[PDB]
Amino acid sequence: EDELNLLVIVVDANPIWWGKQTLSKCIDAVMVLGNSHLFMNRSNKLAVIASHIQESRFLYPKYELLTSANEVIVEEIKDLMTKSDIKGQHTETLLAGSLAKALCYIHRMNKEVKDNQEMKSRILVIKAAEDSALQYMNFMNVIFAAQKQNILIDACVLDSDSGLLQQACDITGGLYLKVPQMPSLLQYLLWVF
Amino acid sequence: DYIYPEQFSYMRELKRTLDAKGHGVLEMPSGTGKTVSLLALIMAYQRAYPLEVTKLIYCSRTVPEIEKVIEELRKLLNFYEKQEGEKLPFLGLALSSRKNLCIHPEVTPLRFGKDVDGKCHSLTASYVRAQYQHDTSL
Amino acid sequence: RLGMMRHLYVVVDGSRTMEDQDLKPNRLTCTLKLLEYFVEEYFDQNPISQIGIIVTKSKRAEKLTELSGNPRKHITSLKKAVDMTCHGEPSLYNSLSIAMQTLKHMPGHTSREVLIIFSSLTTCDPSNIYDLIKTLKAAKIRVSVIGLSAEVRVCTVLARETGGTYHVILDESHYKELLTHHVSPPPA
Amino acid sequence: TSGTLSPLDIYPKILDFHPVTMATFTMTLARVCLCPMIIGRGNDQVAISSKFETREDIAVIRNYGNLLLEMSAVVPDGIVAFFTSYQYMESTVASWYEQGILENIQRNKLLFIETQDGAETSVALEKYQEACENGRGAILLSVARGKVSEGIDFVHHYGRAVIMFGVPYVYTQSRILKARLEYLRDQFQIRENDFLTFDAMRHAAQCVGRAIRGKTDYGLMVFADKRFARGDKRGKLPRWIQEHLTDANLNLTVDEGVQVAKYFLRQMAQ
């Protein structure tokens, strides 16, 4: 508990979730995981970001805050559901944007913490989507920044093939798991990382 | 333009160890640094008295050690003058026997009664005789 | 991390000196076991890359794995080597010539690398090793040595002249630190 | 000066004058150096009486030949074995060229015998610096008085360990030298330790000094003799004081060979 820990969760919003046919369930599970994480230690914090087809957006920004976190997440996702970028209208997601947002937040939190002692942070991606060539430069830029920062990027691929994310974990020294049985999502989040 | 922290710590005491004008004994490392640090410690006195300026002489067991004294001292001076030098505007030289430096004079007068002193006397005599007249033959 | 592609030839000392109990169970067992851990971590850090495996034993060179991009062959080869152990003395010149022959073929923007784990003091080869070191530097084949308790000058020059990586290992913790430094990519 | 000289007395003894004294370098910790002695490790190890070390075959064959082979084979580094004479050197290492069929070392070492040649000397130093145990300054035998004492001015720490097989000692010829021994008895009374032992131990110290070179390097140096405690008194070897803060240069151990290999791990770590 001595070390402050920030875990940023990037959730891939892509309509691939339709294939998942449930998003509602995925949120419920993610919420349980977050609550546990916050409960483990006082010093744990969480940030949640959505990587949508069109852009990346911040769902939320402590455990005392959890009630707030739950409401903010449910509401934020519902807004996201919009028709544009529907189904595999757009196969990819804006992970690069999400990672950029995550690193900015981690940096800001770190500076404040710098006044104090060191902070440990890691980024978790729940990835539904596929990567694309156009995406390569942007994504890698964020990935390499994280590696230099020594911030591990873990990835849980429910489905699809995001090679870049697999590469991202390797470079970053994070963990990558392609989940067989997506309904076991909760177990993977708790157990896998 | 500088010198070692060790030389600065020691210098005054070493100048004092030197003041007695006759003798002294100095403790130093097993070899690396010893001779170069001497040259650095004599830089403090390179002109202690302008009206007479004393000299340094170094005694050495063998010829390969002499090139170790020359190569270190050549690095320390870098040159005879401020034009390229920055510790000592000194002039330094190696030497050893006539018996080592010169092969042809050992070879030519081959006799048992032929001392290395005598051979310089012989060479000097041929040079004076040649200068007198006998350059064409002696 | 992605940006370029690596070719690395892992060379292991299978001389009689590698049997010794100084480093866990014996040096052979501790080195192959950590080297298996390194292959999976290097291939994870370097997804587009290649490795080949060579040993020096009983005054010869032998190919434990051919040059390839699948990690599985190299961990399976390190598993299969432990049973047959180590005896005799090195053959470093013949191992740098087979490694050279594979590495010379590789294209312009990929690295050329040789990683050697060394527990000997010389090598049995007659051929002039200095001609081959000059040729490595022309070819751009970089050679690194991790030595066990040992600084014997021809090996150290050989790793410096080819690129600057002669390291000493005194524990199983220090050897994992050294292999994990080698997992690290080059600039592009 | 002579590098070390801290016990001071011998120079004023030789001069019959009292120079100004001064220590004028900053020294390094004792721990970079290690200065062992060897004599045996069980109570049955009786072959080292050295009443006639020049004639005691059993003693040459036992820890004098056998400890060298144990230390050199275990501690695999470039190591030069210094001897008190050629005759000892020839008896101790059977070599390729043996003085008898009955001699007791079998291992790859190189020789350094008389008619040394300036070009031939370098060949042996090229071999020791390049690789393997053997070369000049490497697993090679040389008499301590001989030319190997000049050393080589290589940057590379070419040397590792030196094992003095016998403590370098000298004699006093029944002529002018005997006349000198009598004079210094008349004046000092304590003549033997100053005139011969101390003067031979510096002969030792030059060869070991040439191995370890100075403050910017590391090393060890072992002595093989029955009478070795006498050598340890009066600071007649490098082991002696240079700065009170250094935390001592002690060598006592229940096993030398293990202590030097542990010390080499410590040096790789540094």
d(CA C144, CA C155): 9
Look-up of token digits 């000392």: C13
**Residue numbers belonging to the annotated binding site of B:** 28-35, 102, 120
C113: three-class secondary structure by DSSP: strand
d(CA A3, CA A43): 7
Q: Which of residues 132-151 of C touch D (CB under 8 A)?
A: 149-151
Count of CB contacts below 8 A, A vs C? 18
CA A165, A166, A171, A172 torsion-angle sign: positive
Q: Which of residues 56-75 of C touch A (CB under 8 A)?
A: none
Look-up of token digits 């002018």: D176
Q: Tell me which residue of D189, D190, D252, D200 sits closest to D231, measured CA to CA.
A: D200
Q: Which of residues 238-267 of D touch B (CB under 8 A)?
A: 238, 242
Chains A and D touch (3+ CB pairs under 8 A): no
d(CA A96, CA A165): 10
State the burial class of residue C187 (Cβ atoms within 10 Å of its Cβ: 0-12, 13-18, 19+): exposed
Q: Under an 8 A CB cutoff, do B30 and D3 touch?
A: yes
Strands of D146-270 (E only): list them.
161-165, 219-224
Q: How far is CA D179 from its chain centroid?
A: 29
The residues near D139 (Cβ < 8 Å, ≥ 6 apart) are: D72, D78, D79, D80, D81, D107, D108, D109, D110, D132, D133
Q: What are the chain B neighbours of D154 within 8 Å (beta carbons)?
A: none
d(CA D78, CA D162): 9
Number of domains in chain A: 1
d(CA D76, CA D132): 9
Whether B11 contacts B38, CB under 8 Å: no
Resolution of this model in Å is: 7.9
Whether D223 contacts D205, CB under 8 Å: no
- CB D181: neighbour CB atoms within 10 A? 16
Whether D249 contacts D30, CB under 8 Å: yes
Residue D268, CA atoms < 13 Å, CB-side half-sphere = 20
Q: What are the chain D neighbours of C155 within 8 Å (beta carbons)?
A: 131
Q: What are the chain D neighbours of B62 within 8 Å (beta carbons)?
A: 150
Q: Which chains touch C (3 or more CB pairs under 8 A)?
A: A, D
Look-up of token digits 């591990």: A152
DSSP run (H or E) holding B33: none
Which tokens belong to D172?
């006093």
Q: Which of residues 18-57 of C touch A (CB under 8 A)?
A: 44-47
Residue C99, CA atoms < 13 Å, CB-side half-sphere = 35
Experimental method, per PDB record: cryo-EM
d(CA D75, CA D264): 9
Count of CB contacts below 8 A, B vs D? 88
Whether D111 contacts C134, CB under 8 Å: no
Whether A3 contacts A118, CB under 8 Å: yes
Q: Does D270 touch chain B (CB under 8 A)?
A: no
Residue A56, CA atoms < 13 Å, CB-side half-sphere = 21
**Domain-wise residue ranges, chain D:** 34-269
Q: Does C2 touch chain A (CB under 8 A)?
A: yes
> Looking at residue B45, what DSSP letter applies?
G
Rounded to the nearest angstrom, the minimum Cα separation between A110 and chain C is 24
According to DSSP, the residues that pair with D140 across neighbouring strands are D80, D110
Which CA distances in Å does A107 have to A28, A63, A102, A146, D49? 28, 21, 8, 11, 76
Q: Tell me which residue of A120, A175, A189, A127 sits closest to A149, measured CA to CA.
A: A120
d(CA C21, CA C8): 28
Q: Tell me which residue of D88, D91, D89 sits closest to D102, measured CA to CA.
A: D91
Q: Which chains touch B (3 or more CB pairs under 8 A)?
A: D
Q: Tell me which residue of C118, C116, C109 sits closest to C17, measured CA to CA.
A: C118
Say which amino acid occupies A39.
F
Q: What are the chain C neighbours of D157 within 8 Å (beta carbons)?
A: 151
DSSP collapsed to 3 states, chain A: CCCEEEEEEEEECCCCHHHHCCHHHHHHHHHHHHHHHHHHCCCEEEEEEEECCCCEEEEECCHHHHHHHHHHHHHHHHHHCCCCCCHHHCCCCCHHHHHHHHHHHHHHHHHHHHHCCCEEEEEEEEECCCCCCCHHHHHHHHHHHHHHHCCCEEEEECCCCCHHHHHHHHHHCCCEEECCCHHHHHHHHHHHC
d(CA D60, CA B75): 49
State the burial class of residue D69 (Cβ atoms within 10 Å of its Cβ: 0-12, 13-18, 19+): middle
CA C74, C78, C83, C89 torsion-angle sign: positive
Q: Which fold has domain D34-269?
A: Rossmann fold (3.40.50)
Q: Under an 8 A CB cutoff, do A167 and C44 touch?
A: no
Q: Does C186 touch chain A (CB under 8 A)?
A: no
d(CA C148, CA C18): 9
Residue span of the structural domain in which A170 resides: 4-193
d(CA B73, CA B96): 18
d(CA A163, CA D81): 63
Q: Which chains touch D (3 or more CB pairs under 8 A)?
A: B, C
Q: What are the chain D neighbours of B13 within 8 Å (beta carbons)?
A: 22, 24
Q: What are the chain D neighbours of B30 within 8 Å (beta carbons)?
A: 3-4, 209, 212-214, 238
The residues near B127 (Cβ < 8 Å, ≥ 6 apart) are: none
C109: three-class secondary structure by DSSP: coil
Whether C52 contacts C65, CB under 8 Å: yes
C85: three-class secondary structure by DSSP: coil
According to DSSP, the residues that pair with D162 across neighbouring strands are D80, D221
Q: Tell me which residue of D82, D86, D105, D109 sits closest to D224, measured CA to CA.
A: D82
Which CA distances in Å does C3 have to A173, B125, C141, C151, C187? 16, 82, 20, 35, 8
